[PDB]
Each structure stands twice: as structure tokens, then as C-alpha cells.
Design a protein around this ligand. Sequence first.
Ligand SMILES: [Br-]
Ligand SMILES: [Br-]
Ligand SMILES: [Br-]
Ligand SMILES: [Br-]
Ligand SMILES: [Br-]
Ligand SMILES: [Br-]
Ligand SMILES: [Br-]
Ligand SMILES: [Br-]
Ligand SMILES: [Br-]
Ligand SMILES: [Br-]
Ligand SMILES: [Br-]
Ligand SMILES: [Br-]
Ligand SMILES: [Br-]
Ligand SMILES: [Br-]
Ligand SMILES: [Br-]
Ligand SMILES: [Br-]
Ligand SMILES: [Br-]
Ligand SMILES: [Br-]
Ligand SMILES: [Br-]
Ligand SMILES: [Br-]
Ligand SMILES: [Br-]
Lengths: 328, 328
Amino acid sequence: IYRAIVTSKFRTEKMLNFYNSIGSGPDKNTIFITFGRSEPWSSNENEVGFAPPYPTDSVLGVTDMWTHMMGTVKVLPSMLDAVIPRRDWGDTRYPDPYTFRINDIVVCNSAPYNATESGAGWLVYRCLDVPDTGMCSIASLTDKDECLKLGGKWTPSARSMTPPEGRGDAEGTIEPGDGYVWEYLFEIPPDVSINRCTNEYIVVPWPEELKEDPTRWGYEDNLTWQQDDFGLIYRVKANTIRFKAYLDSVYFPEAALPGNKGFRQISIITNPLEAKAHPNDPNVKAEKDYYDPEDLMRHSGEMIYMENRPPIIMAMDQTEEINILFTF
Amino acid sequence: IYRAIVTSKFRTEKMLNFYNSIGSGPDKNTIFITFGRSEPWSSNENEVGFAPPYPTDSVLGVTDMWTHMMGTVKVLPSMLDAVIPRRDWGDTRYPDPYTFRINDIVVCNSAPYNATESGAGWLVYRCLDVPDTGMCSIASLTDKDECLKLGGKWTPSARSMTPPEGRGDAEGTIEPGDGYVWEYLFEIPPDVSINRCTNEYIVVPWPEELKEDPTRWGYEDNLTWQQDDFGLIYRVKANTIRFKAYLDSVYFPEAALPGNKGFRQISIITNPLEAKAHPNDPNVKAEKDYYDPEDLMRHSGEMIYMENRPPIIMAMDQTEEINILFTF
Ligand SMILES: [Br-]
Ligand SMILES: [Br-]
Ligand SMILES: [Br-]
Ligand SMILES: [Br-]
Ligand SMILES: [Br-]
Ligand SMILES: [Br-]
Ligand SMILES: [Br-]
Ligand SMILES: [Br-]
Ligand SMILES: [Br-]
Ligand SMILES: [Br-]
Ligand SMILES: [Br-]
Ligand SMILES: [Br-]
Ligand SMILES: [Br-]
Ligand SMILES: [Br-]
Ligand SMILES: [Br-]
Ligand SMILES: [Br-]
Ligand SMILES: [Br-]
Ligand SMILES: [Br-]
Ligand SMILES: [Br-]
Ligand SMILES: [Br-]
Ligand SMILES: [Br-]
């Protein structure tokens, strides 16, 4: 008899609680990324389009993971980035380069066809309104607000004749005139773009990092903080965390030996405990940065994510980058 | 390209994130439950089978929600409960009352058909093994282990003769004889099974309260604490939280008088702010236990949940139990 819904702001909430929960202390969580394996999938595993087996969400799956674990890397917050699907205004290398949709977060000033204010990093804007005529996804209802009395995912006809520029009005509202409307959100720093961003995704700072260094993210001229309190991740429907962990082979010389067939498994384990002598002892939370699986209480903590992929070669003191996408 | 996924523990992990993120300070959350709208949805709202319209997950939705907010109550941890689907052994008022599957969580000792021990609350066992002979999701798979390794859930053709009793062996194993293995999990105190549980949901203690006082949850003999660290919610794949809160008219005189209109909207705002004298005044995260909407800065916080229902009359000195489900 009751009609309820979890609003998308809940998807962001989860993502935030998770990111905030991480910390040192018994009151906090420590997550460890893990790698391991050697037993090659099959012969034809180095082929192109080769899909290894999915990981088995089961205790046998978990143990089959812990058995092949070769080492562990503590994941700190500075390695987690709230990210959203990247969409550059006019990138014809993908679909609909000029036609968008309401609430679509579009990036600008990242390419010659984005160039709007050199010297600044990528500027990200939100699409508030679009051109009248178009399609309402479901049913029909089309005109000035025919699909705006209910507001269903609406794809317009006419295109964006031009990228929005600057930081809009006090509320970042910009009216290009092409029948579109945008809201200036923020500015991504060069290094962040270079180091953290990708072709698929961009980074959204966290409320905290935003409140501490506003100008850094082109968030200073912003007043919507008097309302959202640095809740940008909320404003752009961010609900995805992209990791960025480097495997320091310099740590372990175990597989940094010539041959090596690399590992094919990855897993994120939360709150694993340090191997105890007398099993009837007080469990200890693992808070160091690295660990030898044997130095870790097998099965301790919770395994929230397992990954299977082709083998990855590791050298002497060669640095290997690990990235994963958690969604909420 | 890669073959990876999130395991069941990830969901539990999210629920725990939510529950633990609540409190004071900036890295924690203050959740309020709002109740509002006195004006009828329509003249037929009091008619049986009447459902109002689904709320709209849009800024308009929130503005509207606020437009009609009558009051808001702070949500305390003691009000949230990790709950899992409830399946009572023997409840012949439902399907498979004697036929279970692997990993099913059954409840015994919660009614005559369950009775196993006066002097103990509900005992929640987990089905570990079942009769070899039976049927399978995919017909062409007339074999346990076959259907076991092929995915499909196996349904034993031989029913469970008697309900599992006691706490079992070392890890909690129990074998009546009907070729149905069981694993005792924990127990549920009356004060909880009576106020917290429902027909389809049984409460499961959170780690800290399982720690704070074990024997209470029949988790005393337990040894898994030497590894899972009171992570019971993980073992049962608990990802749902149930809200138990009370709306006292006494604190909202306005909204109540000998003849009011009631309230038809409930929603949840995380981290709202109190009213400001002026827009630039630093943001004052609202922590009081209850607010009149006017005392809160409109649109502050993040509305992660909305819900509309027929009117609920809020007479003088009468409290209303407001329940809310959250799935992660
Ligand atoms: Br109902
Ligand atoms: Br830390
Ligand atoms: Br399992
Ligand atoms: Br597990
Ligand atoms: Br850090
Ligand atoms: Br286009
Ligand atoms: Br970096
Ligand atoms: Br933050
Ligand atoms: Br931060
Ligand atoms: Br150990
Ligand atoms: Br699940
Ligand atoms: Br947590
Ligand atoms: Br909206
Ligand atoms: Br909103
Ligand atoms: Br409490
Ligand atoms: Br049956
Ligand atoms: Br009965
Ligand atoms: Br109670
Ligand atoms: Br807890
Ligand atoms: Br607790
Ligand atoms: Br205000």
C-alpha cells in the first residue's frame, strides 16, 4: 500500500560511507588488495578475446583465492577516487558527441573542441535543461514539458551547438542559446586528469578534499556549499570508486625472478586479522602496509571482491599498476 | 575484458558501512526521518487498496517533500537492525516447510512447529548439507554434485524429519539422521524476537553487540570469533537494514489537534543543516534529536529515501511505529 524508493543519492551515500569507513584503528576499516596465482588457466589463455573463469562467490572460491595469494597491499584512502563516466563535449570518437541529456555530466576544456578557457584544467558541467522537441524514452508525451510533468529520461533532437564556458552565474547556470542549459560544477587538476582520470572515467573530489582545497578544484566561486556542503559527489550521481594501487615488486623478490608466469587473481579483503599463535587469543587487526599471506590469519576479514584475468608479468623492481572499479 | 565481480560479503559490507557511519563528528552521519504532507493525496486515499503515487527521484521530488515536511526525527543506531529473510522450520502455513536447500537459514524454536527448547529464544540454523537424491533447477541435471557444480540450486526430495536442535559440534554441526546437516548460528532474545522481528524478517546482531555481550545472542560457545571476529552478518549474507523508530505527536503540536489530516510522506535525509541567519554563515550540521522543518535549512542534507502512503492520523498522545527497509 506504500510506495517507496531509494533515491540515487543513496547510491552515492553508500560509496561515501565506504570511503569514509576506511581508516586505521579498531573503529575504522582497513582494506587490502590481493594478488596471487601461477596455475595457468589453460594453454589458449594468451589468445585475444580469451576469457578466463569468473570467480566463484563461495567459501571454496574464497579459499581457492587465499591459497593462491602471494602477498598483500594495504589500500589507503589516497588510492580511492570517486569517479563518474567521462563525456567530453564533442568527442566524435564516441556516440552523440553534441546531443546530450538532462543531468548528464559533461567535461569541457580538455580538447581543441572543448577549449573554452586555456590555463585551467578540465571543467565539468551538468546539463539542467535540453531542447524542447525530442524523444521521451518511454511512451510519447512531447512538447515543452509533456515529458516534464513526470520527467522521464529524455533524449533531445537538436544538438549542442557549443560548449558551456566559465563558472556560470552565482549558481553556475549557463545558457549557450542552442536550447541547452548547464551548471558549472568544478575544475579537475592537470595532475589529477593525467594521473587519476581515463577515457572512460574522470575524478570527483570527496567533500573533504573539496572543503580543504576549494580553489584547487575550481570550487571556490561556488555557493551551493551553503546548501550541499561540498556534496558534489551527490550532485553528479557519483557511485563508483576507482582504485589505484601499484604493486611494488621491490617489496617481494618472490616472483620478481626471471621466468615467472605472473598471477591471474585479485581480491579485496576487508579487516583481515594478523595470524595469531594460540587461536584462542585476541584477534589483531592488520594495519601494516604489506603482509606475507602466511603472516595473515587465513580467512580473516571479509572478501568483498574477487577478480580473474590473464597473467601479469612482474620484474625486478618494476612497478605494476592495479585499478579496480567498485560500484554502489 | 576481465572476469571479476563483487561477492555477497560486499553487500553486507555496505550495510555495515551504513550502520557504523552513523553518529557524530564529520566522518560519521546524522540520519533524520522526515514525516509530512497533511493535504490529502485525494478523496479516496482512505479507501482500502489505495496507493498514492510513487515519489519522484528528482529535485522536484525533494523540494516537494520539503514543501510538505511536518517534522523530522533523528535516527539512532539502536533503531537500525540488520535483518535477513525469515524462514521458519515447520511453518506449514507456507511452502517447503520440511524441504530446505543448501545455505538456507532456518529458524527453530519460535512457535509450536519449531519448539526445540523452552528457555531459549529463536535458534537460527544454517543448512549445510541435504539429501543426495532430489531434483534440480535444470531437469537434465539429475545429480546433486552435478547440479551443484553447474550452478542450479538442488532441492532435496527427502524432507527434514525433525527440526535441528542444540548448538552442535565444534563449528556447530548437527545431524538428526534424515540426511540433513545443520549448523547452529546464534539465538535471539525475546525482547528482540518480539519487537524487532516480523513475519518475514528476523534480526541478526551487529558485530559490536555480538561482541559486547555474546552469550546473550547464544554466541558464547562460538569459536569462529577467533577469525570472523563477530562477523555474523557476513555469514548469513545480511544486506538489509530495518528501521524501527517512533513519531511522537507531543513534539509536533501543530501537526496534531483533535481533528488533523495526518501525514503521508516519509523520507530520509542524511546530514541536513539547521536554519542559517544568512547564506554564508558556516554550515551547522544538525545533531538535535528532532526538528520542526523550519529550523532546518531547506534542501540541506541528502534525501536518500522517499516514500508516500495513505494518511496516518497523528492524534494527541499517540506514537506511530515507522518502519523502513534498506537493501544493500
Ligand atoms: Br503495507
Ligand atoms: Br589509514
Ligand atoms: Br558458499
Ligand atoms: Br566467505
Ligand atoms: Br591516505
Ligand atoms: Br550528436
Ligand atoms: Br598518483
Ligand atoms: Br569526504
Ligand atoms: Br578526503
Ligand atoms: Br592464525
Ligand atoms: Br547477496
Ligand atoms: Br563499517
Ligand atoms: Br533532477
Ligand atoms: Br537533490
Ligand atoms: Br543508540
Ligand atoms: Br516440505
Ligand atoms: Br502451530
Ligand atoms: Br524495541
Ligand atoms: Br557493529
Ligand atoms: Br552496536
Ligand atoms: Br536556511
